[PDB]
């Protein structure tokens, strides 16, 4: 397994048609997972599965600018299960990140950070065993 938190450089940032794949297994009794697509210290796209927010499972997405979080976008469709292997695919499209989990579309997140070629890091954190993190062009 890879170390978590994991810092994956995205050389030259992201671009439409770029597909980022994260493979791992959710730990038993997991509480949270986070993907952070970052432009320097800003977080262009935070993707945050929460396994127990008031005894509900929810995916919270947001952007952090100058250390301030913005308006949350929440998705109650929750495809993760404690103890189980998963695949998160983040496809960069011209106007949003498109996320599929286990080959099923999950959500889209409109680009708030617009300098895509400056979003040059993906951080992976939380309650997972991380198997691989990679990217390719489709």
Ligand X SMILES: OC[C@H]1O[C@H](Sc2cccc(I)c2)[C@H](O)[C@@H](n2cc(-c3cc(F)c(F)c(F)c3)nn2)[C@H]1O
Contact (Cβ atoms closer than 8 angstroms) between residue 65 and residue 111: no
Question: Is residue 57 near Cl ion by the rule CB under 5 A?
Answer: no
DSSP string over 18-82: EEEEEEEEEPTT--BEEEEEEETTEEEEEEEEEEEETTEEEEEEEEEETTEE---EEE------T
Structure tokens at 76: 């109650």
Subset of 10-49 contacting ligand X (CB under 6 A): 32-34, 46, 48
Q: How many residues bind ligand X (CB under 6 A)?
A: 11
Q: Decide if residue 72 touches ligand X (CB under 6 A).
A: yes
Interaction between residue 32 and Cl ion (CB under 5 A): yes
Of 17 and 74, nearer to Cl ion (C-beta) is 74
Tell me the binding residues for a beta-D-galactoside.
Answer: 69-75
Which residue ranges make up the site for ligand X (CB under 6 A)? 32-34, 46, 48, 60, 62, 69, 72, 125-126
């Amino acid at each position: 397994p890879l170390i978590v938190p994991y810092n994956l450089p995205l050389p030259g940032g992201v671009v439409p048609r770029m597909l980022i794949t994260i493979l791992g297994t959710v730990k038993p009794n997991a509480n949270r997972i986070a993907l952070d697509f970052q432009r320097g210290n800003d977080v262009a796209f935070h993707f945050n599965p929460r396994f127990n927010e008031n005894n509900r499972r929810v995916i919270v997405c947001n952007t952090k600018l100058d250390n301030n979080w913005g308006r949350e976008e929440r998705q109650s469709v929750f495809p993760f299960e404690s103890g189980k292997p998963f695949k998160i695919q983040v496809l960069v499209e011209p106007d949003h990140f498109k996320v599929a989990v286990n080959d099923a579309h999950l959500l889209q997140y409109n680009h708030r950070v617009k300098k895509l070629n400056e979003i040059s890091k993906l951080g992976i954190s939380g309650d997972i065993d991380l198997t691989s993190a990679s990217y390719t062009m489709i």
